């Protein structure tokens, strides 16, 4: 990695940040008032005898959440292209690691997965909190893998740990989509299936990019290819998800 | 570490395993038939419009779960004191790491925390699955910390990550104990408070032992002290929990 290659990333990051900011502003300006509940069912006696009717504790608005997980990326991409921050960024890229990315992801991906789970029909607060925790744990495992190992040496243990700890929310989503034991006759709409399938494919793409970067082939021996891939996939995922919720839920107003 | 110090651990582990086996047999022989439900509340229309009454999907018996998380430890403590397995065990202890312990813990602690959460009044299946995932992630973080770092060098990052990823279930337990937004007039019993407080103290004890082992003082520079502490605390925790559930829930028969 020479000076010019690290120099072009300034303009690359600036362009990404501008795109994110414009999309956030449009979504804030056009969305209507929609909300989804967080509930809770309490006991009314001994530990396993009698329950009570569910009650609503909180209500999430959707437009603000979408604007939130776009604004986070916009802010971070503008921070990286700053002054002394860029000096530390280049110094860390020279050492084959990046820290800003994981700090961004551990919040953005968690918000995404919470919203996706909430649309499918999950309302308990503890379920959402634990899903948040699981996703953050997966990202931290990726951070540890990047920090403690070296390319082409054949050690891939934290990668496998992160793969193990990132499949639980999708098992839960599958369970609520199959819906065992229910008594109902209303079928799931189509945009739910579209959202689920598309986001699963994007998550698989992120994992594959990590694996190919640390395998060390004859072409992927350069770190900047993986850096550019991580920027582009992040720019695509956010836009692919934010405009599927808007068209179908937030539009009739 | 000399030969005799590694030799005494054979008898130590055998004694621990025998104690676990006897307690498991007693609990199996004396318990009655008690069960707790796993439920689920599904939609009946568009994503955020109409719900349905909760239904029961599964039912956990309690005596079998208690026997399970005692039998796991019994089996592992008998495996370690075997033949060639003991050779590999001693070889790994010479290198300042142990693997059997984490393989045991990642299941035993998860079963414990699932049962503790279920007693407090949590019934959603996704909540229990994600709690399982979070606890396993914490144990794996401990494994990575032990594998990739060295005592007295001042690096404690995976320890902090494991501390971060192990506080979510207790936040959920606190939320269901405070019970915000409910309409009820029945107070929580006392053995619930006893169980919660005691198990929180024991988990803090485990974390403290890890930290003191890897700080490297003038007295804790020997690894076998930490090994013995991990055996004793595990032998106490299991017994402290299995006989508080039995006396109060499983006894009137």
């Amino acid at each position, epitope marked *: 990695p020479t000076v010019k290659e690290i120099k072009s990333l300034q303009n690359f990051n600036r362009i990404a940040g501008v795109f994110h900011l414009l999309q956030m502003l449009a979504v804030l300006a056009l969305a209507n008032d929609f909300a989804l509940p967080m509930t809770g*069912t309490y006991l009314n*006696g001994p530990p*396993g*005898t009698t329950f009570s009717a569910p009650v609503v504790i909180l209500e999430t608005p959707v437009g603000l959440a979408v604007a939130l997980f776009l604004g986070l990326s916009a802010l971070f991409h503008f921070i990286v292209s700053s002054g002394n921050f860029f000096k530390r960024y280049s110094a860390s890229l020279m050492k084959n690691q990046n820290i800003f990315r994981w700090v961004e992801y551990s919040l953005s991906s968690s918000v995404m997965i919470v919203l996706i789970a909430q649309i499918c029909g999950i309302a308990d607060i503890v379920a959402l909190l634990a899903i948040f925790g699981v996703n953050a744990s997966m990202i931290l495992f990726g951070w540890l893998q990047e920090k403690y190992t070296q390319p082409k040496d054949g050690d891939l243990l934290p990668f496998w740990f992160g793969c193990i700890a990132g499949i639980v929310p999708w098992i839960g989503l599958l369970i609520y989509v199959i819906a065992p034991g229910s008594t109902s006759d209303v079928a799931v709409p189509g945009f739910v299936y579209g959202i689920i399938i598309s986001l699963f494919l994007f998550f698989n793409s992120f994992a594959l990019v990590q694996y190919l970067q640390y395998k060390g082939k004859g072409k992927w021996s350069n770190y900047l290819r993986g850096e550019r891939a991580y920027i582009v996939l992040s720019l695509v995922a956010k836009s692919a998800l934010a405009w599927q919720i808007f068209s179908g839920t937030l539009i009739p107003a | 570490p000399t030969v005799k110090e590694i030799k005494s651990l054979q008898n130590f582990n055998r004694i621990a395993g025998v104690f676990h086996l006897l307690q498991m047999l007693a609990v199996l022989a004396l318990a009655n038939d008690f*069960a707790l439900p796993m439920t689920g509340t599904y939609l009946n229309g568009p994503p955020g419009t109409t719900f349905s009454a*909760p239904v*029961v999907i599964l039912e956990t018996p309690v005596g079998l779960a208690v026997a399970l998380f005692l039998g796991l430890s019994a089996l592992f403590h008998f495996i370690v004191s075997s033949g060639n397995f003991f050779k590999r065990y001693s070889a790994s202890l010479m290198k300042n790491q142990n693997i059997f312990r984490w393989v045991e813990y990642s299941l035993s602690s998860s079963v414990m925390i699932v049962l503790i959460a279920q007693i407090c009044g949590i019934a959603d299946i996704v909540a229990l699955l994600a709690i399982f995932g979070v606890n396993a992630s914490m144990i794996l973080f401990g494994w990575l910390q032990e594998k990739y770092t060295q005592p007295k060098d001042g690096d404690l990052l995976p320890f902090w990550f494991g501390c971060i990823a192990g506080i979510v279930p207790w936040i959920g337990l606190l939320i269901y104990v405070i019970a915000p937004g409910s309409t009820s007039d029945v107070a929580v019993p006392g053995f619930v408070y006893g169980i919660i407080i005691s198990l929180f103290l024991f988990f803090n004890s485990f974390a403290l032992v890890q930290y003191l082992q890897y700080k490297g003082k003038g007295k804790w520079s020997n690894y076998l002290r930490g090994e013995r502490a991990y055996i004793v605390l595990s032998l106490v925790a299991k017994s402290a929990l299995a006989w508080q559930i039995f006396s109060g829930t499983l006894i009137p028969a």
Partner: nanobody
Amino acid sequence: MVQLVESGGGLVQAGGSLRLSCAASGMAFSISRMEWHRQAPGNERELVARITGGGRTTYGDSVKGRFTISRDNAKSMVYLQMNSLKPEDTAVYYCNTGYFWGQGTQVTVSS
């Protein structure tokens, strides 16, 4: 408030059969566990059946092979079917949950 109201009972012969019914109130009926209790005029109390809200059923070891408890969701009903009675079941029956009792009913068996 939780209100449990049961009906049925009365006076029958030795070989008769009965069907007692219990109706519940503002709780989550599809999860909670319901019970049937019996008190004789002169004894303390007993246990008759449990339904555990999921399907499983346990009895009191003195009425096995004679009684049958069932539940009906979407109407909040608990049914107890008594067959092949004996001249000792003269008693008062109560519908029970997590200590929210109800006003029992009288069952009488003649010779």
